[PDB]
Paper text:
The bacterial DNA polymerase III β subunit (β-clamp), and the corresponding eukaryotic and archaeal proliferating cell nuclear antigen (PCNA) are ring-shaped proteins that encircle double-stranded DNA. They act as a processivity factor, or a sliding clamp, for a wide variety of proteins that act on DNA including DNA polymerases, DNA ligase, endonucleases and glycosylases. The structures show that the bacterial sliding clamp is a head-to-tail dimer, where one of the interfaces is opened by the clamp loader to allow DNA to enter the ring interior. In this paper, we describe the crystallographic structure of the DNA polymerase III β-clamp from the extremely radiation resistant bacterium Deinococcus radiodurans (Drβ-clamp).
The crystal structure of Drβ-clamp was determined in space group P3221 to 2.0 Å resolution using molecular replacement. Drβ-clamp displays a strong negative electrostatic surface potential on the outside of the ring, but a more even charge distribution inside the ring on the DNA binding surface and in the dimer forming interface. In E. coli, M. tuberculosis and T. maritima clamps the positive charge forms a relatively continuous band pattern across the surface whereas in Drβ-clamp the charge is more spread forming small positive patches separated by negatively charged areas.
Numbering used by the authors:
A (entry chain A), B (entry chain B): 1 to 361
The structure:
C-alpha cells in the first residue's frame, strides 16, 4: 500500500496555505477537497477556489505512490493537532491513515477520478524577488476597489522598467504606488485584487517566477505554484491625477501623525466620509473632527516649507490611515492646494512608496 | 468650573471595568451612559446593565466637584487613545473637555437628572478573600446552565462551613465543586451565573466584603462595589448524584489527557454529544471517536487501581474538557461503572476541586 513519512512542521505549512484557499463549504462536494499527489520526492498538495489554483510541494519519503482526495480543512486540523514531529501517511482502500506515536487517525478519501486536473506551467518568463513583490503588493492593495465602474481599477497594475518594477492601485481618484527592484524585462499585467491577497499569503523572500498564459498568470516560488486570472484592458493613465504643482510641504513623525488621525477620527460623523480637517499653520499641524457626540482636536509640531504658509484641507480619515500605513519614520505631506490632491510619502520618497489623496468636496 | 487631574493608567483601569458592564447600545438612551461623581479624593465611575450595578473609585485631584453623565464606551475609547500619561477633565455647561498633551476632546454630557440614583450598601456582613473566591467561581462556573429546567441550577451555590466555604454548580447531572478558605460564617446564597462572570472580572487578591440585602447582594473590594441579584429557592441535593462506590481509579497527566480528548473528538459526529470512548486496560487509557468522516484513536500510559482491571465508558468530550480545566499536574479519574457517574479531581482531591461527570447512553 502507499505509505509516506513526512515532517509535521512541513506538512502543517503546506496544509495551512491550502486550507486558506480551499473553501470549507460548497454545494460542489469536491471543491472542498485537497488533492494529494505522491511521487518519490514527496507530496504535492493542491486545490482550487475557482478563482485561483494552488499547489504546494512537501518533501517526503514515499513508497508505492498513489493519488487521493480528502476534505482539506479536516485533514489540516488533524495534522495540526498531532503531538509528535514525524507523521506517517498510509492509504488503504478508501481510507487514509494518519499516525504519530500513540495517535492513529483514519479519514475517508473521496472521488479522486472526479477531481479536475490542475496544471501549473513552468516557463520562467520573468523572475523577481517574492519578498519585494509581496511588500509592494501590501503597500498598494488598499487603493483597489471591487466596486469601481472601470473593471481595470478592481486590479493591481504591475509595470516593468528594466532594473525596477512598479505596482499601482487606484479608484480613479486616490492612487497607491510602490517601486521595487526587478530582474526586469517583462510585460504589464493587471492582477485581480483578491488574487493579490492570496499572493501576499504565499510569497516569501527569495525568487518568484512568472509564467504568462492566456488571460492568466502562474507564479512559482520555493515549493508553491499559483494560477490566477489576469484582467484585460489597459490600466488608466494614473499620472494625470498625480499633482506636480506643490505649494506646501510638511514633514513630521509618521507614528505621531497616525496616532493623531486615529484618535481624532473617533468623533467624525458615522458617515460624513469620516471627515478630518488638516490645518497647517505656524509650524504646527492641527487635526479636527466633529460630529453628534462632540468634537476633537490634536496639534502636532511639524517642519513646513513652501510658497503657502497656511492651509486648511478636509480628508476621509480612513483613507488617510490607509495612505499612511506603509510610511514609517517620518512622513512627508505635499499639498497642491486646499481642495486639490495631496501626496503622502516617506522622506525623499525613500523605499519607493507614494500615496495620492483627494480632498473631500 | 469643575476640573480634575488623573493618571491615564488608573482612569483606563476604571473605565475598562465599567465599559464591560454598561451596554454599548440600548433603546433606553441613558442605559449606555457612565455616571461620574467627583469629590476631593477622586472620581467615582458608576453604571448598570439592569442585572448588576457597578461603581469604581479612581483617585484624582479635583476642584469644584460636580457630577455628570457621558456615553460610557465612547469616553473609554477616547481615554484609551490619548497619547500622554496624565488626563485633564474639565466640565463647562453640557461639555466635558478631555485633554492630554496636544489632544483636546469635547464630549456632550447627558441628562444626569434622569439617571437613576445607584446605591451601594456598606455593612460588612461577611469577609472572604477575593482571589480565593474568584478561583473557586472559575472552577465551577461551567457546570451552571441558563437552560436548566430548575431555575436554581442557573446559579452558583455558595455554602459556608465555618473556616471553609464551598461553591457548587450543576445541571442536575454533572456537578462542579470547589472548597476554599473562608473568614467567619455567612448566609448560603445562589448567585446568577452571568453575575458570577461579572464578579470574576472584578475580583482580585485581597478582601471582598458581602452586604446582604433583600433578594440581592453587594460585594465590595478595594476598587469596586457591585450590586447583583440573588436567586430564590433551595439548591438541590447534589450529594445524591456523587458516586460513592468507586471500582476503578486511573491517574495520568491532566494536560496530556486534555490534548488527547481534544484531538480525538474532532472525528465524533457533529452531534452525537461529542462522543469519546474511554477504554482502560493494562495500564493504558485509549480514547476513540468515530463519525461520518472517519475515526480516531489515541493511547496514553496511566497508573491504575481498584476492583476492576478494565472498563469501557463513553463521555461528552466537551464536558470532559470542562471538568479537567481546573486540574493541573496529575488528574485522578474515578469510575463507578461503565454507565454510571465518574469523579475527576487532582491527586488526593488536593486544592478542594471535584467534578462529577455522567456517562453517555
Amino acid at each position: 500500500v502507499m505509505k509516506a513519512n513526512v515532517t509535521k512542521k512541513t506538512l502543517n505549512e503546506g496544509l495551512g496555505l491550502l486550507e486558506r484557499v480551499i473553501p470549507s463549504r460548497s454545494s460542489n462536494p469536491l471543491l472542498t477537497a485537497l488533492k494529494v499527489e505522491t511521487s518519490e520526492g514527496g507530496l504535492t498538495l493542491s486545490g482550487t477556489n475557482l478563482e485561483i489554483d494552488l499547489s504546494c510541494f512537501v518533501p517526503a519519503e514515499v513508497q508505492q505512490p498513489e493519488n487521493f482526495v480528502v476534505p482539506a480543512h479536516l485533514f489540516a486540523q488533524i495534522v495540526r493537532n498531532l503531538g509528535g514531529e514525524l507523521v506517517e501517511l498510509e492509504l488503504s482502500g478508501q481510507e487514509l491513515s494518519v499516525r504519530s506515536g500513540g495517535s492513529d487517525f483514519k479519514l475517508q478519501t473521496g472521488d479522486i477520478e472526479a477531481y479536475p486536473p490542475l496544471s501549473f506551467p513552468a516557463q520562467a518568463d520573468v523572475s523577481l524577488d517574492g519578498g519585494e513583490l509581496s511588500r509592494a503588493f501590501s503597500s498598494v492593495r488598499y487603493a483597489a476597489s471591487n466596486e469601481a465602474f472601470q473593471a481595470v481599477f478592481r486590479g493591481i497594475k504591475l509595470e516593468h522598467h528594466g532594473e525596477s518594477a512598479r505596482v499601482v492601485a487606484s479608484d480613479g481618484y486616490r492612487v497607491a504606488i510602490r517601486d521595487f527592484p526587478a530582474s526586469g524585462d517583462g510585460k504589464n499585467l493587471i492582477i485581480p485584487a483578491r488574487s493579490v491577497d492570496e499572493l501576499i499569503r504565499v510569497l516569501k523572500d527569495g525568487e518568484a517566477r512568472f509564467t504568462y498564459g492566456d488571460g492568466m498568470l502562474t507564479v512559482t516560488t520555493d515549493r508553491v505554484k499559483m494560477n490566477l486570472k489576469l484582467l484585460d484592458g489597459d490600466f488608466p493613465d494614473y499620472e494625470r491625477v498625480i499633482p506636480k504643482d506643490i505649494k506646501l510641504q510638511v514633514t513630521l513623525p509618521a507614528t505621531a501623525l497616525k496616532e493623531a488621525v486615529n484618535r481624532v477620527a473617533v468623533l467624525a460623523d458615522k458617515n460624513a466620509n469620516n471627515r478630518v480637517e488638516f490645518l497647517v499653520s505656524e509650524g504646527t499641524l492641527r487635526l479636527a473632527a466633529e460630529g453628534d457626540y462632540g468634537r476633537a482636536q490634536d496639534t502636532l509640531s511639524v517642519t513646513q516649507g513652501g510658497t503657502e504658509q497656511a492651509m486648511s484641507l478636509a480628508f476621509n480619515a480612513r483613507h488617510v490611515l490607509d495612505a499612511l500605513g506603509p510610511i514609517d519614520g517620518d512622513a512627508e505631506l505635499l499639498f497642491s492646494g486646499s481642495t486639490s490632491p495631496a501626496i503622502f510619502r516617506a522622506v525623499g520618497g525613500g523605499g519607493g512608496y507614494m500615496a495620492v489623496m483627494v480632498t473631500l468636496r
